[PDB]
């Protein structure tokens, strides 16, 4: 098999297939996939048809898989206008939450960004694109890049974790040349890499450079991360990626992106395992209603996906394929164990064992920049609340965790409980909060938007439409 | 047609048919019907098969409908053991919430309760039945009944609205005789009654006496109120009854029971109208999930119900049938308008018109004993919260309603928001509560169980099973 990982695409539950396109950050607030589909009707099926039809295209070819700009252009056309930008300006903002100091350093060092005329710096959105107060690619002394990357990062934080102050204007000179150059470097380097980790590092390093060069007018994310990225992953015999936040392939470093991709691959493994074990899938605090599933099942239309669901992987060992991805993802195990536990662990006994002998600093630990986005500035408590992890929240409350701690968005465990509409988790926190003398001060905590937990609670489930009801 | 009201049984939406058996008080907390079915598996279908098979039995008979003890016994057998109690003791407790001063007066005046040896009074549950501190049927001076009925009622309140202090031990002498006597009185009196209101008064008066004489060892409620009661209602060309609390046919008066039955008939009219208008049915704060409906549709098994759904009422005018029930229920219109509005009204404009020119005493009005059970001791605010009436709660908040007022169970609008798990209504109340100086005092309000709103919120959706999860 040219793409042995296609086995995991087949194992992926049909009724949850949208999860490899819809960012996990949206699930709880937008009825899983519904909000993503309403923004661009037809976009889920087109993205699924694009992935499956091109993966089937590579598999049905004797020759060994080689990345090409024709491959990329076909992927863009399918996600839809098939052609590259020439002179067209493309820009976007980047919040602190989608950045890292090591990531900023690397981005400033991309020679094609300096020669291509790309711009990056602090500023404001203007009538025809960003109005830069500064552009870091103007007179950039390469010696100053480590110190400037620290400054840019602290400046992005000053504005707010989820707020956009920094803008990026892509390259407008020789996009076709850079596209071909990135492709050549990939094909040369991938052949060099011997281990799976080396391969992953090469893949993420190239996907990042493809994203940063924003070659298309639209759909760069879906093209490169939700499609392209999954092909070399499957080539390696790995599952495709289910992301919480895929929009990190600009200001994150290649090293930190390996971790981001591994966590995304782990999500797919949890999705498959839960479905196989007849367990109700609960990842990122989202429980799909039967109405949501039936609406998706009736909406689903992808012939190339149907061919993969009935594909013959009899001449392939699923056990060796399973043991290989388990070994590859084992690097995830000893990093922010309380945080990962609050996301993945549901067994009361495993949770109790994990929280044993842990101190006040470990239970209240807020992860710093560089970790995959969901962790940054968050306590295990914030993470239990967003994941619906009642067993973890109970253990944390028993461990005397501080529930008034605000994350980098100014949000407490109470703001997320209100935002997710969880009455039970909200009740547990409020029972705790009111048993302490500063109860009223804690309830009145305003986040970065000057909003209280009860302001969000008051807006929970409020229609997105102009309706009297 | 012998039972023209059968037309309304046909109009009743199949997927909501359980609503004429499951008390509206359970809906929000027990996933509509699920909790009722789990207490006695098979009990919903048996009750539906009993109603439809006997109604079909009366319709398929030339002779005019006459109540008989054979009819009653057949109904009991079908709800299941078909036979009457002889010597067997049957007892139950009655809380203040299921009583009225006028109702207590009438009950003490039932001559068959004195001669039959029934007991009623304050007390405690004992190993073999109640342990009476007093029995009002011992040396009852009929002159003292109005003053004693007031005392009994105030004593039942002292214990708590939803708490049981008063016990009733049914008749153990000549049940067969009283059953026949109640039946004869009914058949004689119904022929006397000329108007629909007179007929209703006779029906409720007799159903009450049948309930109070508890002739069966089990299922007296279902037999007499969910089955028997619906036959003369349909005979009159009226819809069957959908109740919030049917367990009022012991200590409520015949006059107050006409109102209880009219409100129950109005519920059926709202159910039918909402289904006909493709409106999602929301009565008593319960919105059925598609899983709940499909589980009920697959569980539903009643051949006699199937015959009624395809029955031919072509030789009957549905318009005259509709205009007659509208006239009959119009008595409901000018009683506790803010309360009924909080239950039934969803249109922002109608609600705003209704709350115009209303004072502080009208907006904060708590209904007294005698009204149908859902109203007693409740403000329009408590009622909006239990009904999910967001448009009414907004109007009430704008009208400066007091949200800290506790009902006869010691519960505030906040306790019901927590109990119903409504994040949005909870948020609205908390935004209000925190903007006032005594915020903390309001949140810490304990009901009759010494429980806070957040104690209930912490227990919302907690499993009823021994499960680790
Ligand atoms: N319908 C869509 C399409 C894209 N997106 C957002 O855009 C990201 C990918 O960017 P592209 O538009 O470049 O494909 C997604 O991860 C998601 O955050 C969305 O939110 N709804
Ligand atoms: N399965 C059942 C059957 C009856 N009930 C309760 O009993 C009442 C009727 O009493 P019976 O058992 O006499 O029929 C119902 O209105 C309801 O409150 C219940 O809660 N669950
Ligand atoms: C959000 N993003 C910066 C990762 C991709 C946006 O791509 P595009 O839609 O501008 O082409
Ligand atoms: C609850 N109730 C008093 C109206 C009826 C109980 O009847 P039963 O179940 O004791 O026969």
UniProtKB/Swiss-Prot annotation, chains A, B:
Localization per record: Secreted; Host cytoplasm
The Fido domain extends over: 140-274
The reported result of mutating residue 214 to A is: Abolishes phosphocholine transferase activity
The ANK repeat boundaries are 376-405, 409-438, 449-469
Question: Can you list the disulfide-bonded cysteine pairs?
Answer: none
Please give the function described in this protein's UniProt entry: Virulence effector that plays a role in hijacking the host vesicular trafficking by recruiting the small guanosine triphosphatase (GTPase) Rab1 to the cytosolic face of the Legionella-containing vacuole (LCVs). Acts as a phosphocholine transferase by mediating the addition of phosphocholine to Ser residues of host RAB1 (RAB1A, RAB1B or RAB1C) and RAB35, leading to displacement of GDP dissociation inhibitors (GDI). Phosphocholination of target proteins also impairs accessibility to GTPase effector LepB. Can act on both GDP-bound and GTP-bound Rab proteins.
For domains, the record's comment is: The FIDO domain mediates the phosphocholine transferase activity.
Name of the protein in question: Phosphocholine transferase AnkX
Write down the species: Legionella pneumophila subsp. pneumophila (strain Philadelphia 1 / ATCC 33152 / DSM 7513)
Upper lineage is: Bacteria, Pseudomonadati, Pseudomonadota, Gammaproteobacteria, Legionellales
What gene name is listed for this protein?
A: ankX
User: Which residues of the complete protein appear here?
Assistant: 6 to 484 of 949
């Amino acid at each position: 098999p040219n793409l042995p990982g296609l086995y995991f695409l087949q194992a992926y539950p049909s009724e949850e297939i949208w999860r490899l396109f819809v960012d996990g950050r949206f699930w709880s607030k937008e009825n899983g996939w519904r909000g993503y589909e309403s923004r661009e009707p037809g976009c889920l099926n087109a993205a699924l048809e694009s992935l499956c039809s091109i993966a089937l295209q590579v598999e049905k070819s004797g020759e060994e898989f080689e990345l090409s700009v024709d491959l990329i252009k076909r992927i863009h056309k399918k996600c839809g206008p098939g052609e590259l930008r020439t002179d067209e300006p493309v820009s976007f903002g980047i919040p602190a939450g989608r950045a890292s100091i090591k990531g900023i350093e690397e981005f400033l060092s991309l020679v094609f960004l300096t020669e291509g005329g790309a711009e990056f710096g602090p500023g404001k959105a203007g009538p025809f694109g960003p109005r830069f107060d500064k552009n870091y690619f103007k007179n950039l002394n390469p010696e100053q890049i480590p110190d400037l990357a620290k400054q840019i990062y602290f400046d992005m934080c000053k504005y707010g974790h989820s707020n956009t102050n920094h803008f990026y204007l892509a390259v407008m000179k020789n996009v076709d040349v850079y596209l071909e150059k990135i492709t050549q470097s990939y094909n040369k380097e991938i052949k060099t890499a011997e281990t799976l980790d080396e391969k992953l590092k090469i893949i993420v390093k190239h996907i990042r450079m493809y994203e940063v060069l924003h070659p298309f007018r639209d759909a760069n994310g879906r093209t490169f991360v939700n499609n392209l990225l999954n092909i070399p992953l499957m080539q390696q015999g790995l599952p495709p990626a289910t992301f919480y936040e895929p929009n990190v392939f600009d200001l994150y470093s290649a090293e930190e992106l390996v971790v981001v991709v591994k966590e995304a691959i782990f999500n797919t493994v949890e999705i498959i395992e839960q479905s196989k074990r007849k367990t109700p899938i609960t990842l990122y605090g989202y429980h799909s209603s039967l109405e949501e599933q039936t609406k998706f099942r009736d909406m689903l239309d992808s012939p190339s996906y149907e061919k993969i669901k009935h594909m013959d992987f009899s001449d392939l060992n699923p056990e060796k394929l399973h043991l290989k991805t388990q070994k590859c993802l084992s690097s995830l195990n000893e990093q922010y164990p309380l945080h990962r536990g609050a996301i993945y662990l549901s067994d009361p006994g495993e949770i109790k064992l994990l929280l044993s002998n842990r101190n006040e600093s470990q239970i209240n630990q807020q992860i710093e920049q560089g970790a995959p986005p969901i962790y940054v500035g968050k306590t295990p408590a914030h993470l239990a609340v967003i994941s619906g992890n009642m067993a973890m929240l109970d253990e944390l409350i028993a461990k005397k965790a501080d529930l008034s701690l605000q994350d980098y968005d100014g949000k407490t465990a109470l703001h997320y409980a209100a935002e997710c509409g969880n009455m039970q988790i909200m009740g547990k926190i409020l029972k705790v909060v009111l048993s302490q003398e500063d109860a009223i001060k804690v309830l009145n905590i305003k986040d970065n938007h000057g909003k209280t937990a009860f302001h969000y609670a008051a807006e929970f489930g409020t229609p997105e439409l102009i309706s009297a009801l």
